[PDB]
Amino acid sequence: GFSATRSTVIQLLNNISTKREVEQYLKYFTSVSQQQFAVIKVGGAIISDNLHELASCLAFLYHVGLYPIVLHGTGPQVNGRLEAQGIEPDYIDGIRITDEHTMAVVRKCFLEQNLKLVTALEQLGVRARPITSGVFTADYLDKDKYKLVGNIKSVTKEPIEASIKAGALPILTSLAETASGQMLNVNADVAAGELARVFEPLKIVYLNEKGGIINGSTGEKISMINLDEEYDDLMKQSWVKYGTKLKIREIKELLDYLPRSSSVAIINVQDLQKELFTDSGAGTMIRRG
Amino acid sequence: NGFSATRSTVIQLLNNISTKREVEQYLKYFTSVSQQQFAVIKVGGAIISDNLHELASCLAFLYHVGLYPIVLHGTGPQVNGRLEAQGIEPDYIDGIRITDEHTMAVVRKCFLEQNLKLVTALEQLGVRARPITSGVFTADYLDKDKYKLVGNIKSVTKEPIEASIKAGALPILTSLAETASGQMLNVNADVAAGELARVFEPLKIVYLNEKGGIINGSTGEKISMINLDEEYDDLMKQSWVKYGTKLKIREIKELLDYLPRSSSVAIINVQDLQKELFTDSGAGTMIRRGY
Amino acid sequence: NGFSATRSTVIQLLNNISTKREVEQYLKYFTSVSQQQFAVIKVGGAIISDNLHELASCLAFLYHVGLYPIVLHGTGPQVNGRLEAQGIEPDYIDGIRITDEHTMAVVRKCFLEQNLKLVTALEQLGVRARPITSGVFTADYLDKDKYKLVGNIKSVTKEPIEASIKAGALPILTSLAETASGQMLNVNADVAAGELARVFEPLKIVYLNEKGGIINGSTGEKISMINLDEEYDDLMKQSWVKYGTKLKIREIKELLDYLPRSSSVAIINVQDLQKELFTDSGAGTMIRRGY
Amino acid sequence: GFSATRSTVIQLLNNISTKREVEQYLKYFTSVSQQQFAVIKVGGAIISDNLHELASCLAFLYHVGLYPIVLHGTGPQVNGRLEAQGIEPDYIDGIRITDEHTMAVVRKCFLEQNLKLVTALEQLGVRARPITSGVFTADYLDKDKYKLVGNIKSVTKEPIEASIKAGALPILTSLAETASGQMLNVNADVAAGELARVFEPLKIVYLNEKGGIINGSTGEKISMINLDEEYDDLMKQSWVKYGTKLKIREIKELLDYLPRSSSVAIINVQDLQKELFTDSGAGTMIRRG
């Protein structure tokens, strides 16, 4: 069955200081149920920039009996390989145009990156299960406008539950499929949001490198956002562009559905353990007012 | 590859051993230090719904003695039943299914369920299994207007399968393919399995069916041996060589034209899998290039 | 020493942790690399028959976090009951049992049963335990004609206890002794445990009883602290210091005259054992040399 | 739970060739009833002369799931340490006179040797349980004639069954105790016989260095003895003296009680595996006619 080395337990004791922190951990350690601990979204950047530390944190979670649902993008590497072979990434309305060749590259990267993370975990003794399809079902977002780029309509939970029941961290790509079986590129930030919607986990964490969201107006990191008060305002501010725009969109929608206790934490990997085990996060914390 | 003989492993190993010949045959495989892949194993989907426990037990045994097979399975009768439940009739032409987009939705859904059933079946026996549903087979369309979403395989990416085996987990593949662009295409599992054989050059190639081999429809008897250099051309021009047997016996001949003379594809019932691999049984239909 | 925190270990470790002080106390013992023996633990036989599950769980925890204690237990009330069943009355004189040959047969048989119960209780929680029924305590007769087969311990052979701990199994000792010539002699478990302390110089010395410490019979309150350099002589000349408490408090004073000032003997209820060892509880009666 | 390495299984396959050899192993591997596999008596000599190989064989049995009951003497080492300190071993009627000091040495040796075998096993990954008392109960053989030397009246099986149930080989000394708790020295060869009597195991094996019993008349090893025909005769032969005398006595008595299928095999360690797995022993095989 389950057992934990002295390092693992030392690291557990290093994360847990108060009584409610203790009870929180015990709640999810001993939980037998299909309401999970965490959805963690991993920026693709992180896998090629900081794999060891990403793999170590997740490894630690697994070693203390916590099975977060991991879903990663493949952002920069796709743009890299396109540019590498004399192709310039095409964009419009803040979303990538994906033809027969571009999806070929997106698929290739997703597989490469997903296997990199899975293997880094396995090497650290963590049972990791790649889940590259059969989770997201989508119809086209705007067939003519964006080509092979979808919009998630439902989430089949079964593969993920099967994975956790077997003692393996599910490691998901954000690729979707039409029912008919055309793979459609979907934004990792909204794909994680849809996982969060159905699994209603305790913790929703998005990992990026900047460790939050920066207010361009001041150049200071935004520590808290109270959507009820600030959503409409924040969307009008000129410094909010591109990927911070639709990220905040999904997170409002997501938190409109989820109860008042839930929140989304946008953080750096180095704060992950501290975010999961305690009620004091760093980075940008986004909750409903 | 982790060797770890559990109680049930030890009992299964010894159960039908009776002569020093059989003992010496097992020692051959256990004392070996070959970096060669042990087996490609094609599973009729029927076997997943009808004999999941037997299938899983036999694969468990191979896992536990550190002789990991690559497993490729089809979707069984379910697909047609599920379509029959909604009322859609299966159209085959020349032995291949007219897989339209509505039909594909059901094929996908069946593959995913069958695949996870077998994978969980193994996990429940403490056998690490890794479901590989995509990124292995890449295919062009076979004939868009004729068969619709059915593929002809062109390349095989070995990486996920290897990753799985190195990680200590049996790779369990569905036999779907995708175009480079990401459209899933249904592919004949007998062909799919053959392609894996072509690329992994394994010690044993095994096809599992419920009939327990290939039946000679004219004499009503199971065919034990097939020398393909001599028997192939006359065996093909027959009335009892079915829609699905044409493609199965064809791919096997093409595969053994590419593989060396030492190789051979056995077609057997699940219950005869252990004795087919380790003893040199006359069970099922054995097929080889021949003199 | 093997650290291996099972689920129940992790739950027991965290269950009463509430401040960073308690967390830091557990890190003290886990990050340590001391070659010092962790504990000698004396078990009233009553606890084996009455609270075996609690005893076993608490020892299981120490085992699983690799802080193995030496455990020395008595034979509880059973002996007297078993004698009372056959009709023989227990004779004590000055606080020690007149153990004749018939009585010894019962004492032996009880010790062996109690010892195996506790050992098996541990094994059933997946804790290796080794029953050590002889070859540890060697004794002269205390007073043949007075107490008959009762011993005064003279030497202790450490070897079996060390062998056990090195093999990864808790040593579970009965408190019998033998003459060099091999005659078994009944010995006071409080004294026996003290002798192990004397020879192993452990971090913690703990005596388990059901009462939960020593009760001050005049005020009806439990005594939390005893500074023996100051309090001993006046604490002895009292009406509520019983037959059995004289010898218990006496041996503890003699032992701490031999041990250094850092040492201390705690007397507590089984349920407070974990918090007594790792946190610095005020539960039970604590006894030390003092200023 | 239970698992076996590739070496262990290779060695199992090397011992098992025929179908009934296979069925025999499986019968005792899968436990079935309160039926023990083997009582093995180990000459004390073997523990100080050939420990590694003794430990390896027993280790192998344990690794294939067989739990023999091991009971060892302490023959030569006791005589050694007496002589080592200027004391000559006293003897009479073929049995050792054991006073306050001699028993002191016997006890010391039994503990030393019993821990040596137990540790040799533990070092090879075998769970071994020392069982030094509480098994044999004996009254004096002839108090005045031999002093502290007993005669076994009963065997308490519980410690041994407890050991096997816990997955640990019981490793017994041949020391007995009066009910009143005087330890009485008992002959390992007859002590094993009393274990054999109550446990009615499939295999009774006595290990010695010569690997059997030698007929002094010819100087040839005796391969078979049919007690019904030869007991009375063999006991009259002048070459049968000392420890072969009362060894053959117990084995006749033992086999009078046990059924016709049972036998005692007196062999060398190097033949142990072959003795236990097959119906063809070396050394001296003693059965009822």
Author numbering:
A (entry chain B), D (entry chain D): 63 to 351
B (entry chain A), C (entry chain C): 62 to 352
Verbatim from the authors:
The first step of the route is the production of N-acetyl-L-glutamate (NAG), while the second is the phosphorylation of NAG by NAG kinase (NAGK). We report here structural and functional studies on the arginine-sensitive NAGK from Saccharomyces cerevisiae (yNAGK). The structure of the mature yNAGK, lacking the N-terminal mitochondrial targeting sequence (residues 1–57), reveals an unexpected novel tetrameric architecture, which can be described as a dimer of dimers with D2 symmetry. The AAK domains occupy the center of the molecule flanked by two pairs of interacting DUF619 domains.
A truncated form of yNAGK spanning from residue 58 to 356, corresponding to the AAK domain and lacking the C-terminal DUF619 domain, was produced as a soluble protein in milligram amounts in E. coli. Four crystal structures of truncated yNAGK, ligand-free or complexed with either NAG or NAG and arginine, were determined using for the initial phasing single anomalous diffraction (SAD) from a Se-Met derivative. In the structure of the truncated yNAGK without NAG (resolution 2.95 Å), the lid is observed in two different open conformations, which are, however, less open than in the structure of the NAG-free EcNAGK. Despite the different oligomerization of yNAGK in relation to other NAGKs, the AAK domain structure closely conforms to the canonic α3β8α4 sandwich NAGK subunit fold, with the N-lobe spanning residues 96–272 and the C-lobe residues 273–350. However, in yNAGK the N-terminal extension comprises two helices forming an angle of approximately 45°, and a 5-residue N-terminal extended coil. These three elements form a platform or “stand” which mediates and determines the interactions between the dimers across the Q axis of the tetramer (labeled “interdimeric junction”). At each interdimeric junction, a four-helix bundle is formed by both interacting “stands”, burying an approximate area of 910 Å2 per subunit. In any case, the interactions mediated by these stands result in the association of two yNAGK dimers into a relatively flat rectangular tetramer with approximate dimensions of 35 Å×109 Å×83 Å. This tetramer is perforated by a central hole of 18 Å diameter, which is formed between the two domain bodies and the two interdimeric junctions.
